[PDB]
Enzyme design. Sequence first.
Site, mmCIF file in Angstrom:
data_model
loop_
_atom_site.group_PDB
_atom_site.id
_atom_site.type_symbol
_atom_site.label_atom_id
_atom_site.label_comp_id
_atom_site.label_asym_id
_atom_site.label_seq_id
_atom_site.Cartn_x
_atom_site.Cartn_y
_atom_site.Cartn_z
ATOM 1 N N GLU A 299 62.326 40.204 24.786
ATOM 2 C CA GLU A 299 61.002 39.775 25.217
ATOM 3 C C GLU A 299 59.856 40.578 24.598
ATOM 4 O OE1 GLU A 299 62.189 40.073 29.469
ATOM 5 O OE2 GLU A 299 61.725 37.936 29.608
ATOM 6 N N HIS B 299 57.781 40.610 33.739
ATOM 7 C CA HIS B 299 59.011 40.841 32.995
ATOM 8 C C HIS B 299 58.984 42.127 32.181
ATOM 9 C CE1 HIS B 299 59.663 36.181 33.136
ATOM 10 N NE2 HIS B 299 59.428 36.719 34.319
ATOM 11 N N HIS C 161 60.914 28.750 33.620
ATOM 12 C CA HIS C 161 60.834 28.657 32.170
ATOM 13 C C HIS C 161 61.896 27.727 31.604
ATOM 14 C CE1 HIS C 161 58.746 32.882 32.123
ATOM 15 N NE2 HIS C 161 58.092 31.980 32.833
ATOM 16 N N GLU D 75 62.588 32.681 35.373
ATOM 17 C CA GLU D 75 63.444 32.147 34.328
ATOM 18 C C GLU D 75 63.911 30.734 34.648
ATOM 19 O OE1 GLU D 75 62.899 35.754 32.104
ATOM 20 O OE2 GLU D 75 62.778 33.563 32.015
ATOM 21 N N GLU E 101 54.836 36.783 31.922
ATOM 22 C CA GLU E 101 55.445 37.896 31.202
ATOM 23 C C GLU E 101 55.101 39.329 31.596
ATOM 24 O OE1 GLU E 101 58.178 37.313 29.264
ATOM 25 O OE2 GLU E 101 57.767 35.370 30.206
#
Lengths: 387, 388, 511, 511, 167
Positions: free
Chosen positions: C193, C230, C131, C128, C227
């Site tokens: 997400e 995640h 990102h 994160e 991802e």
Amino acid sequence: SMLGERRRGLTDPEMAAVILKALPEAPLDGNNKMGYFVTPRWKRLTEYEALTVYAQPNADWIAGGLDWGDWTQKFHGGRPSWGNETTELRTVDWFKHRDPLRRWHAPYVKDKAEEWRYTDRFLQGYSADGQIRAMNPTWRDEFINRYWGAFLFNEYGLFNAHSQGAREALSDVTRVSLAFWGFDKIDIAQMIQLERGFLAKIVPGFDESTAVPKAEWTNGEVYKSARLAVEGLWQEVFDWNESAFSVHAVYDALFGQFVRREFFQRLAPRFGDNLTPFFINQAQTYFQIAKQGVQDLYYNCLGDDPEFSDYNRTVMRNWTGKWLEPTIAALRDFMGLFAKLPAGTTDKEEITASLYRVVDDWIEDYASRIDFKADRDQIVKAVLAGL
Amino acid sequence: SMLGERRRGLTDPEMAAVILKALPEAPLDGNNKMGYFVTPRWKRLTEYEALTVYAQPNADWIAGGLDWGDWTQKFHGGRPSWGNETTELRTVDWFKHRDPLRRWHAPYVKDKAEEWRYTDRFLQGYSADGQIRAMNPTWRDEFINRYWGAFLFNEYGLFNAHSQGAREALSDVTRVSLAFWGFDKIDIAQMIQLERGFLAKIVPGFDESTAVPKAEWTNGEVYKSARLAVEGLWQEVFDWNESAFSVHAVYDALFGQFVRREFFQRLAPRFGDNLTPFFINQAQTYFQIAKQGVQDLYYNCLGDDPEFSDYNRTVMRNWTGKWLEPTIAALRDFMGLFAKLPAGTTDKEEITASLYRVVDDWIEDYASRIDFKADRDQIVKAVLAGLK
Amino acid sequence: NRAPTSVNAQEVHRWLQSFNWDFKNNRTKYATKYKMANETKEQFKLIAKEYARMEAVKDERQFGSLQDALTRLNAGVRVHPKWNETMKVVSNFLEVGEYNAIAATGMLWDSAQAAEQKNGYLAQVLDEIRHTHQCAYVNYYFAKNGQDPAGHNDARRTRTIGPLWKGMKRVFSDGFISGDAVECSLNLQLVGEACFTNPLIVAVTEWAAANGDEITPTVFLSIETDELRHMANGYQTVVSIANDPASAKYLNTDLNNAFWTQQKYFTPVLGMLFEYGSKFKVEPWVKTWDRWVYEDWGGIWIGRLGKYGVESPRSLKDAKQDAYWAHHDLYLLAYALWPTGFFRLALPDQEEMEWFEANYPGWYDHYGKIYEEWRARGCEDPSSGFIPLMWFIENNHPIYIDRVSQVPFCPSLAKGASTLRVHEYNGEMHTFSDQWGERMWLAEPERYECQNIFEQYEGRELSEVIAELHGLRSDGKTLIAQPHVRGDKLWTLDDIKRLNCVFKNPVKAFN
Amino acid sequence: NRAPTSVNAQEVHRWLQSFNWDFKNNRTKYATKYKMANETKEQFKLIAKEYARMEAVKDERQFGSLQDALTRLNAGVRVHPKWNETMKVVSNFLEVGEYNAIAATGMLWDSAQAAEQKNGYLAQVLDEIRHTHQCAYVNYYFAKNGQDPAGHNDARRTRTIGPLWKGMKRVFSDGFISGDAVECSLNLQLVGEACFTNPLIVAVTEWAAANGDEITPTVFLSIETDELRHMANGYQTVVSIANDPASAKYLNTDLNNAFWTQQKYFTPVLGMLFEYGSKFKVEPWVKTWDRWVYEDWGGIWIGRLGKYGVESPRSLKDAKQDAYWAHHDLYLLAYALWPTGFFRLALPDQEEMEWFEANYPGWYDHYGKIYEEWRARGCEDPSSGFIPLMWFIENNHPIYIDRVSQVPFCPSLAKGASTLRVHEYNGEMHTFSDQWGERMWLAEPERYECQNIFEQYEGRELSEVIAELHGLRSDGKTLIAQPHVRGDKLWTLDDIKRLNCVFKNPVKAFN
Amino acid sequence: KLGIHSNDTRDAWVNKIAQLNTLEKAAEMLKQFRMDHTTPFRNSYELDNDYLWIEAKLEEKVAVLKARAFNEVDFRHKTAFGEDAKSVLDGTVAKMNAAKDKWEAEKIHIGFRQAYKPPIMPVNYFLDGERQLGTRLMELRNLNYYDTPLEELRKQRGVRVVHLQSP
Ligand SMILES: [Ca+2]
Ligand SMILES: [Ca+2]
Ligand SMILES: [Ca+2]
Ligand SMILES: [Fe+2]
Ligand SMILES: [Fe+2]
Ligand SMILES: [Fe+2]
Ligand SMILES: [Fe+2]
């Protein structure tokens, strides 16, 4: 202007349309693998092989060549640009060699660059952490500065020994490995000076000048036989293979390994010196990397050549014998260095065990590869007589 | 198909023509500098600053925030998403902090990656060079496997002490620095295990299981007080700044530095162990990198705050005293390890001088910055009582 | 034997679960109705060093493309104007979601007791941060090399002027970190997400590419590669609490609330940015939404968790019913309030109205006609002295702000939901747009006290607000926001001041 | 004092000059007439580690752009057919230049006595290796992702079939490593790179971009960044021998010979590849050549070396007279012998013929009419049984190969130079195209014994030579080479075999 | 002067805060402020647009005064009012665990925040309270969350329904 004056065929509407209009419906050949005709050393062809093998324009009269005819321009006298005449060794194909680590330029500088930046970081932390406070002053101002520094001329000399090989190598795969072997050597020499330069900054009275270490190398007595062996491997040898072979599979494998691994990398730690070992870690990493390539060329390729196996092993046994003497001589002149160490630093029992480690590793890694019958006991005995 | 089905506005003639037609003759503003409104710490705004400062949507009621109004959704009870209430420290602006190394994500993982790949090369070179041969067996099987190994849990605990801070930090620059301080700690714990795993491969009989190191940590005496201090710093501290400050400017600066530098780094070489120092070099590099950030946040920004300087120093002084005692206890118990060493390895004078190096470095780099009146010989004498 | 040997990440990770030890106070510092299983495991066997290497490799390709080829192709410029503006909002708004996700996962890392589960969350904490910096880089790059830097260069402070930002903080900031750690995990990972963020990131690269933007695809496609980790974290959260009695009691309730929270903002906003913030269209929002929310998420993904007690959100049906016209109803409001943004907006062009009418029967008779009238009133011309907001006042169409979601709504002028609930409580008025948000406030009044733009700007002249919050270009006079995307006839602060628009709190009308 | 401290490249390089020591046999292993001063210095103070870092950074951008953005844009495909073919030759031919340069700088490294000068040459040794791999990468990339892999995928062996390759080896292979180290240095650095190579690399990125090729610019612009270190090497070579008395006696002749050697090949070859291997034009070669050779090199560059006794090549005036039509004259031969290549060629289209005439008055009446005659006769159609070489035979226009430069020439048709000197010596005939090359051979016959294609292929049927040297595409029947760049009607080995074309040594007609 | 970030109201409170030079007086004003202007139970919404900022300024003064007046032990373990923080925390948690329902629970938690928010209670104890009090509040509130109809929930909350609209 925001758009610029230059029109690009990929983005310009008018030009791109013309290009798209000329394009075929599909590729004019489904074989999209460059180097597809190269024989893979491993399961599938690698990027390393594709980008390297056959870059050298050798004609068929140079074992392995794919071209034809004489060279276009030669030396006054008629000497060819590249010829079989530049080395005693023969083979069925000079392009057989393969660096086990598959290093072409990109991977090579990527790795050395990581080492450079981490080196910088290490130094900044070492100095900030005050770790120099626990290092033996004599070991620093004497053995590291004078004797370790002087060794930089040994590596530098071995570096230059590759000059002719860079010019005469008979194939791309061999030229690249050779160039990397030599560049790593100059790196080490520059790292030895780097440390001395670092010490100069954190130790008020330390002088980084190469004057002291150079004098030790040129007129000293500790590295006398060493320097003589280097000047010879470098300027008295005109066979690019004899130079590489002898330097890596004989001299540096015996003398060099002993000095770096069995002397400084083994004793520096006893004087509260983790600095020097930080650089030797690099030199040893490099040594072990080069070794894999040195082994693949002279043993896997030449030494085991389907047509010149016996022939080449003979020439190498001859070279091994030819240089084993100056090397042993170098090791002897080096033994004299122990007498300058503070009392109780090390004993004869240890050095004897270290020498055997070097000699045994050499035999297992090099000598036995070409059926060279070396006597571990006589060698150690011959060297040990230098104490 | 060779060309594909999807048409792209950058390369498709028809679409690109439409796009080019709608374009202005020149940019609608000449200020092409994202983050131009940020007050630069150095000569010119850095990429580090531009990409980081003000990413945290704090409102003005949290010192330095540029937004306005309350949070949109709070905790049951009313606790704010982020708030002044999560730390005793006060400041004119929580966004003043700057990592002196200017580490944003890209440069951070780049350097660690370089260290990872070189570590792998080193190990492959170490094993192939057979350097393990000259390492003292007792040092290896007893001190590296058990005692250096048990230290992984210390670093692991300090890593975890950062969990709450990752959640509560009152600014982007502080959150990023805190995250990186914590991530470097877990990395070290993993490098200690990495070494144990390596040894298990090149040394027949060496067990990489953590059972022994963990039993040493949880039930041994050498690390008892160290573990007690770690459990406290991690789970009994609910203030994100007391946690970061006490961990980095007290406990790890004294106990951590002593164990890594004055015991293992200092003695490993004496047993022909160049392997452990390879990893400690990384730990010390990380320690010194974090120190710069810790010093900037707590001393440059908070301890020297134009409005809360006196207040913040009072608080950090309070925290130093609170955690110095448990830290001395940790060092005191650690003294017990020296008796386990083979006779002649080191002596009381070397040990004492090494303690003083750590204490003196701590007073210079940390204590003095907040006027904490530390008495070096009193601290050392308290620790020496643990020598068996 | 001196065979070259080393140790990889998995070999070390094998013993990571044992890193944590027991002691009385080893427990999460955050309030939670749940208990994460002490021996929960993680999907990817990573360690710090290997995590860094795999991300560094990605950065290398990404920044290499951006700094070399893309820059040489002038990729920052050759993008449709509307999309250059759309990315100011898309990139900066997502940025905060990425940022708060750092704190959110630091909170889950604290919640998890099993070392492996903590480690999984830890990797997201680091992702994160990456990102955040990546989204920041998109704005940074467009500001440095694009056709209009304003907004891209200061969104972190200019976004505070407008109402759309408030809703973004609810779903992607506060919703991610304020509440039960598990509730936050649902908003962030299980819903945010899985249902919206991931599909959205991919979709944005398509719309971006169609509009000439190759910058966003380069960064967002790289974001997307992280991802999988995640998703595993979200799924693992549910697994870690499934065997706890509290789960059967609370899970579906926190999930339903999370779903409504996220959907409430993205259902209208995403469709708006996609359809109205672009020249070339990729796909109608109506079908994209149904596939994303109903099929992909509320069917496939949601089903896989049935074995853990997870059920489809009870509010799923309401969401769909209100979805259809939602984004259309919102653009009318965002455009009417264009002077409060940090981006330039445009009225649908003739070709676009056809597309809208074709994909949404009845669009023209409602929105089409309205935009044509505003066009006639000179909403695009600086000398008209007209702002669509005036139209809302003249026609008595008050715009309210949902106290819970912060989403603006005009019940008197909306083809979608038209409900409005107004309550008075201890001296304060509150306006809600739906029964789910209303319940949230009634049950948890102290969680939702966000003051809206009308409350904060009450009695304030429009130009004064814009000026105070730095809503101007470098010349210090031209507005960042614009009612059109052309290069000439840009509105100035003075043009707004002449309008003499003064904010009123719509709810004060009630007695 | 524990301030973070380190050491940089310059601080180590400071003592690099002292790394070398004196001893009897410390001298070059290569024959040379000059003496490089043992105290010569280098311009860039680098050590191995810093060198790697600066190059690694460039690689990052380059490969990042190639693997990511460029591939996503299908940059390997959206290139004009003619340019895709041209890059097969440009990249591979330059590759060998880069490769032999490794050996050359290795020889120069051995020649230098001063540690610094050795270090300077060393950096290029490594650079040349990087460039070899970069040129290799271009072909590798276009093979993997392009519209026609053949040739790109096997140039290292298919280039041996054609005559253009022979001359490339003379200037970029043998010319770089066979002879006095200093002579090689002149061919490689003082003349080669300074006069042609560098200007060429940049020019190539220009023509590449014009024809849709963004792959080459990405690689070649990266190679370009390494050139400042090589210019210094060349310049320092002169400074190193300037003092030696032998210099005054030999420098200017080795230089002149070097200049003629390089221009003899590039003057015609480069202009051909640019003007005939492209669709979109950047600039007329006559204009380019004049700027490069006369203005930039012959003037500014050579001028600065004046203080070192360097003089403008005496053969310069001759080079200019022979240049004008050189590239136009050669393409006629290249196309007539199209079946011997490893790339596909196209005849000028209408727009191009107009461009040629506009820029080279008289072009159409000679070259243009010939191409139209060949085309109407069916040189593009495999069922025509016509290959332009036949036209040369029919009209008694023999094609010779210069024994020295290897450049093909046709004195009876050439609009440019038409001199021809034929000699017999010890049972062997020799053909020369100019007075400078003739002298070289007369003075150094043993240096030039290269067999030409007519000698090697004498009496052999064309299709057998192609088949034997693997001039076929994957299907094992279609030729790699083609007389057009369209996707249909590709010539096969059988189409060639039926021509019954048998090579003859044109020199034997004088017997 | 009516700005968002700077206005007469904020200026007025800054001057007021400047005259709080005693810990006891400063602390009492902060608590009073919280009862008067924070949470949905605030006595008034008159300072809605500035209370958050003003509260922070008030906290700053109380903190600075507390650090000067309290010895090290008290700064860590006593509230600004001289109470033993642990006792207050434990006593409040005990009440929370005895709460018979979600309505009683919300009053306990909200009231705790108004009275003890950090400058008053040491942060370590205050956040430990947030952890425990928050947990119970949620457990009680989230049980059968949707069973009560909106019509009835509005009555339980005690809002005055002003206007209702629906298709
Ligand atoms: Ca002693
Ligand atoms: Ca004292
Ligand atoms: Ca009323
Ligand atoms: Fe993310
Ligand atoms: Fe994510
Ligand atoms: Fe080159
Ligand atoms: Fe070059």
